[PDB]
A paper describes a structure:
Glycogen synthase ([name]) is the central enzyme in [name] glycogen biosynthesis. [name] activity is inhibited by phosphorylation of its amino (N) and carboxyl (C) termini, which is relieved by allosteric activation of glucose-6-phosphate (Glc6P). We present cryo-EM structures at 3.0–4.0 Å resolution of phosphorylated human [name], in complex with a minimal interacting region of glycogenin, in the inhibited, activated and catalytically competent states. Each [name] monomer consisted of two Rossmann domains and a tetramerization domain and interacted with [name] in a 1:1 ratio.
While processing the [name]–[name]ΔCD + Glc6P data set, we observed that one three-dimensional (3D) class appeared similar to the inhibited (T) state and was refined to 4.0 Å resolution. Similar to our T state map, where phosphorylated Ser641 of the C terminus interacted with the arginine clusters, density for Glc6P in the allosteric site was apparent for this structure. Unlike the activated (R) state, Glc6P in this structure did not interact with subunits across the dimeric interface, because residues 290–292 remained disordered. In this ‘inhibited-like’ state, all interactions involved the phosphate group and were identical to the activated states except for Arg586, which was not in a productive conformation to interact with both glucose and phosphate moieties of Glc6P. However, 3D variability analysis of the Glc6P-bound inhibited-like state showed a unique movement not observed in the inhibited state without Glc6P. This appeared as a 2.0 Å expansion of the complex from the tetrameric interface; by flexibly fitting our inhibited-state model, we observed that helix α13 moved towards the regulatory helices. However, the R state is in a dynamic equilibrium with an inhibited-like state, owing to competition between the locking interactions of phosphorylated termini at the subunit interface and the conformational change due to Glc6P binding.
Numbering used by the authors:
A (entry chain D), B (entry chain A), C (entry chain B): 13 to 289, 293 to 629, 637 to 642
Write the structure that this text describes.
């Protein structure tokens, strides 16, 4: 389909690009995966002219960085001068899929120059940094060393090439500000993945999404003592040849907060080849989740397991940001509706959110051991029955069915039966809370009244611990378990881009998101009639909370009323949707951003035609 | 234990050895495996001075010979002269385990010189060859080219090394005779694996083993028109520095026929590493043979399969040489004895001997299909029963055993039951004979009256076709099937060395042989109280036929009366016996023969001390 | 969806139905499976009032019939009188999925009455039967005993119920003619699956489908001496309360040949549950077919196997009826087109048609053995390499890649390499023809020039033998092999209904049929835009041969030009199409036919409203 070499035929000649980011070869956040995935295609387009600028960490260099010698004499002399001037910079490869060249800068080896660098920064842009941040000083040092390295590289080259600088986050924006300050012949691109004040204002302040035009950012930066971070972020955003954002919602957020409309939007992608390794895997995962729910619900298995649906929500433990309260309230409403209608369907909800636990509870382990004992007894009895039937059937005689069970088989069956006796109800959580009184999820469940009762048609399972293949009760990784679920509900409120819903959708599981996330807006914009492809968008921007909850309840009820053939068709449609989120297509927006940057920086040599051409209308 | 480098520390210096044999890189007989196994250790001792002399075949060079360039200039010039004088000789490697150097001589490229070579051979030793043999002419040509190559190699070498020639069979004895005729400074070793007149005299003539001293070999060579072959064989045997045989029985045969006592006996060995890849394999093979006998004996399975013993005899279709008649008569006697004693044991006899068949019979395929259908029906019913039991047992209720079978399960069971109806008796052979009237095995079975009747305690299975893993009814190779059998009975009359009993014993299966084979004599001489190690020797030399049969019957009855613990102990003892038949130990006799040859050829440089030192007394 | 109990709510009361057919409990033709599949649902609707009338065979009663006692006294007395009057009739169950009640009539026990029955038949309808048919006499006897049994059952019942007779083929039409002759109060349904003269006229006569209105059936029945069979068939068709056919093409055939328009069309169905046991199975089958083609094409594997397509045609060996010549000519044309366009795609054609063979050819077995040896060598080397890499990697050292291969590994690789040497071309057929000179398929292949050459882009594989799981080279059943193929092409000319294309389509494999078959017309009528669902209809009725061939070539070329995503979507669409051909829906037409029959026979008690209501418009 649409490859990188479609329509951007451009004279690249002697051009070098720097992918400056604070997290390269240092796993801190989530856009680490974005850089790791984009590196392969970007380097394939760029050949050997792709560099990454980032801080040095002993752990990172020990685990995934292989030190090497730089291939050009210019890098040799620049590194020699850089080490001989009182700093410490190393060179090597990044041990990832693409294997790009990396320069690592040790911010701890330049503490002597912070006093003069702060003064120069103030004399250049009137930016001050308090002494107690311990993070902004690191950003300032990283920017100073980055701009000094760029200046030395351009100055010491016999022939000056076209250098492109690309920064990603406000810990690196000081470098962009400084390189623009010193009038270096460089093309600067600034891309933001999350507004700094967005996270601060969403928590505490109410109706942050209904008051964008009524926010005078200066004060809100003032009272939180994050004024200087916003100052450098906004300054770096302003003095950029091309300004870029990751999603539309963040685009409006930056426009109303950073006071600059982003020129191009660049969604985050991923490599679909590794995830693709498609119904056998889902069937196996569903069967083994059936095994798990049989283990947990021993002694209360009064509902058909062929008409049960599995819902799940995952991510970091943010009750409000992920909208778990909305999901819980809508689950209660759906339980009420199903109980009224007398339906045979059952909904089992999973909640994978980290919490502060110590060990498992006795009930879950007891149930799992009981299930294992029942399975073993059934296997032993069925093996004995099969052997007896085979031997009695070779002699051409009908099996006398009343004599295939003897004393010890009855003893084992009886032991199993008394093992499956229970008077209480299955627990709603599989661990022991250390803050059970202050837990919001459990408090909400208690308020809405879901205790896995016999009459309840909706079951709630809370699994705080990270999902691992070595777990005593769920020895499975995140990917395989997600593959088997029926639907993923993410009623998020504030999220610049949804990594988890993207992973769910690329997997081929129908998902529910909001118009309030980058993924939701991307899907809504790039396809028509999204409901047919297994994606349901919750309108949260132009609606109240009760409206958002009723709509989500209606979506869930509509999903629960679908027949098996309808679910199969919807699942096939969502299967044939993974290629929209791969870097093979999403990498073109970054390339267009680069072309804009070169056109702005060197209009004499480069000229760009503003082509914004780039699709899935319908299937029924 | 005993390695090659134990006690033969000898100054080898510049010595070259030629392993002349007609079959090298050309699979014809059985000692091909002997050479292939001995090559690795002999070359390891000899370094790069190990050569093989043999005829050229297009198929052999295409399948397992890689042509190469000879590593020494002497070989270069000898090959160049050899090709330039009117012959055609190539050089290369043998694609086997050891990878030894091979020289291949094309006997079809020297038909021009046969007229003069026959005259020279007659003028040298008065040996004539008739024109209609088509095999002795090839031997004469091979010997002439071999001796000419040796003479050219020794003559054209700047420094003359100590050359050792080793021949193996009368197709190569002409070379030994010629090299001794031309007084070449070579050490000649002649080893025979089978006397030529032994096979001719065993068939037809009676009591060949009771009249060795009353045989005037000249006439018996005369009437059969094999006089010249015996002449060259005996002449080559006489004019050898060291005369060697493969087994003791062949030693006496050569002494009373070739009129020369062999100096050293060299038994054939094999590499035990590949065979060793030890009760799991036997259990699996026994279970699958149980599956086969269940398939064959459908509708007549009235005997316990936990008390059944499996006997087998294999090899080429020689009724008298392998003594199958003795085995059949003794099986009839044992059936009579077991029927009298009212024992619950059952003996199933296998006969793996190639015959002239066309296809399988209908009965065996029908039985196998019936068994497969029964197995499939049992598996389906047992799966359904297990699933129903599991679901009914999760709810903590005892299985109502009278409702786990429904209409279609009863239908399938009934269909199987009417499928297992048979009025006739199982066939004694699994194929269709083209000479059923003239078959000796079937005639003997009919005479002794074993038709697999219900009252019969001994079952006979005849499997003419080669045992292959792709067979429709026995998809198994020889090794795995032999691993699972209980006992291997080989009442051989004439066999210089037993490859099949050796393979059976190295495998770890108790076996019965005779004092009339090389393997039997070897085992009897090298261990004390052989009965405890799972080997039973039948005394056939000093006894009549009726005596040999009664002794074999007694041996079989004693084996059948053993308990399970006794069988386990005997099997472990026979397991710990494989290292006696490996080239790691059996290769020392060849090395001693080489030392004798060098001592005889060049007494000035070499002197040997006649050490004949080389053990398993008992275990209960 | 649409079940049997949708809209036909009707007072059935005391009604009995007889499913008269000559093949019940006697496997002869193909509609045996139709009856076996329809029995379950028909008996479920009918309770215990479903009977089958058919001849007695010892083999059938021994293998799949369980004799039982009839549950009603009326059947007791009728059977007693029937046996006491000089005939021999038994009672029992049919050992099939539904388990319906069966009455079996021995036609060989009533040879005494044929003389009077022939005279009575002639005096009733002037129908004569020649003495040398040996099949029409059996039909006459079956009809006489059937009508006598029906008359005795209705006469001897204390209260007379509403009896329904259903016949299926002209071997049973005599019964319908006789019951209509004797004015029994019975509802008669006649259904034909194939016109008798259709098969006779398609062979020999030209343009049978362009001359229906110009055929005066009397003569063509006359010259072939099949006049009396057509006479009884047409007479039975005329004197039927309801006339039924299996397909539209047969409907027009009966209208223009039997001179009676069929009231209702009843397509044949099947149970989709057993076939459904869906991409994992196809992937496994495709991989193993890749294994097979690797084995067959050793030494000529110069084409990519990831861009190869597998076509297949199967059925009985009818060159003209199945249109194999058209397929071969179009394959040649497509090979020409692909060779011109320089495409990388390759087409491998399979031909599963029984022939008169004796054994396999040497080349195929040699290739399979070579492939097995290569696979074994690769596995051994890869295991050794993995073990060495693991051990050398535990010590934290990079693998010295130049030392992981030693002498014996190189020897094995070399042996494999010389094993894969071949000078000739792969054979077009895997067996040895006994009539290679007179074989039409091979003659056509030779004429069109497809010898599996290197430059050829289309490969032809002919597999005459029945496909079995025990085959030496293709140990697979029909179902699993068909599951893995890419497309099934059936350019049939004369076929009343396509069992093989129906099995292919219900499996989920895109298929090509003609408007000239029952399946093709059914699909064309019941869906709109058939090309989107993976079915391509060849217009053969209104077109010449060259037109039919060009259209098929265009269809194949269009299929070959599809991308992988297009193929996946088409395959999912054809997956979601199996429920159209199940008896859960196709069984309603038979039920409507029954209601028509009861309305015609007893208008006083029953009245039917002519509802002909019964759908898949499109997806893209
Ligand atoms: O999760 P479900 O709604 O039960 O669907 C799971 C379905 O099970 C089986 O019918 C097949 O494996 C289908 O391929 C799969 O889609
Ligand atoms: O524990 P070890 O001394 O290594 O002995 C373990 C031996 O390994 C292999 O040789 C065989 O499986 C033996 O049956 C087993 O006894
Ligand atoms: O036969 P093909 O055109 O190669 O399609 C086979 C395809 O292979 C893999 O991509 C998947 O298993 C698909 O589910 C399957 O459809």
């Amino acid at each position: 389909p649409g490859l990188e070499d479609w329509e951007d035929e451009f004279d690249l000649e002697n051009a070098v690009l720097f992918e400056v980011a604070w997290e390269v070869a240092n796993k801190v956040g989530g856009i680490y995966t974005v850089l790791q995935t984009k590196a392969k295609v970007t380097g394939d387009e760029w050949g050997d002219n792709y560099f990454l600028v980032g801080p040095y960490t002993e752990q990172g260099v020990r685990t995934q960085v292989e030190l090497l010698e730089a291939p050009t004499p210019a890098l040799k002399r620049t590194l020699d001068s850089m080490n001989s001037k009182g700093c410490k910079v190393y060179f090597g490869r990044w041990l990832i899929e693409g294997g790009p060249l990396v320069v690592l800068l040790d911010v701890g080896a330049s503490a002597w120059a912070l006093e003069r660098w702060k003064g120069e920064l103030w004399d250049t842009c009137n930016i001050g940094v308090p002494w107690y941040d311990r993070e902004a000083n690191d950003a300032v040092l990283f920017g100073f060393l980055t701009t000094w390295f760029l200046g030395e590289f351009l100055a010491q080259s016999e022939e000056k090439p076209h250098v492109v600088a690309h920064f990603h986050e406000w810990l690196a924006g000081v470098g962009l500000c400084l390189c623009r300050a010193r009038r270096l012949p460089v093309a600067t691109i600034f891309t933001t993945h999350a507004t700094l004040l967005g996270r601060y204002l969403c928590a505490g302040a109410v109706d942050f999404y209904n008051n964008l035009e009524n926010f005078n950012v200066d004060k809100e930066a003032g009272e939180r003592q994050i004024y200087h971070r916003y100052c450098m972020e906004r300054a770096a955003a302003h003095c950029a040849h091309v300004f870029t954002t990751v999603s539309q919602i963040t685009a409006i957020e930056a426009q109303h907060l950073l006071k600059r409309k982003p020129d191009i939007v660049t969604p985050n992608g991923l490599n679909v080849k590794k995830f693709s390794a498609f119904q056998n895997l889902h069937a196996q995962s569903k069967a083994r989740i059936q095994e798990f729910v049989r283990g947990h619900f021993y002694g209360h298995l009064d509902f058909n397991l062929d008409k049960t649906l599995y819902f799940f929500i995952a991510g970091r433990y943010e009750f409000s940001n992920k909208g778990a309260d909305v999901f819980l309230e809508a689950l209660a409403r759906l339980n009420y509706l199903l109980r009224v209608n007398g339906s045979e369907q059952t909904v089992v909800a999973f909640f994978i959110m980290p919490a502060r636990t110590n060990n498992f509870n006795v009930e879950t382990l007891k149930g799992q051991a009981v299930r294992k004992q029942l399975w073993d007894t059934a296997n032993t009895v069925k093996e004995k029955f099969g052997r007896k039937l085979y031997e009695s059937l070779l002699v051409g005689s009908l099996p006398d069915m009343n004599k295939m069970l003897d004393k010890e088989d009855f003893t084992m069956m009886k032991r199993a039966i008394f093992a499956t006796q229970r008077q209480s109800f299955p627990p709603v959580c599989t661990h022991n809370m250390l803050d059970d009184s202050s837990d919001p999820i459990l408090t909400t469940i208690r308020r809405i009244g879901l205790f896995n009762s016999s009459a309840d048609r909706v079951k709630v399972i809370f699994h705080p611990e990270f999902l691992s293949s070595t777990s005593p009760l769920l020895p499975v990784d995140y990917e395989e378990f997600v593959r088997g679920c029926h639907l993923g509900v993410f009623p998020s409120y504030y999220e610049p881009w949804g990594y988890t819903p993207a992973e769910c959708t690329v997997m081929g599981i129908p998902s529910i998101s909001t118009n309030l996330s980058g993924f939701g807006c991307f899907m809504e914009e790039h396809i028509a009639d999204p409901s047919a492809y297994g994606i349901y968008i919750l309108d949260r921007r132009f609606r109240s909370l009760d409206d958002s909850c009723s709509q989500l309840t209606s979506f869930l009820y509509s999903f629960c009323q679908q027949s098996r053939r309808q679910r199969i068709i919807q699942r096939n449609r969502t299967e044939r949707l993974s290629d929209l989120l791969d870097w093979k297509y999403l990498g073109r927006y970054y390339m267009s951003a680069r072309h804009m940057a070169l056109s702005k920086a060197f209009p004499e040599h480069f000229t760009y035609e503003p082509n914004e051409a780039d699709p899935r209308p319908a299937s029924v």
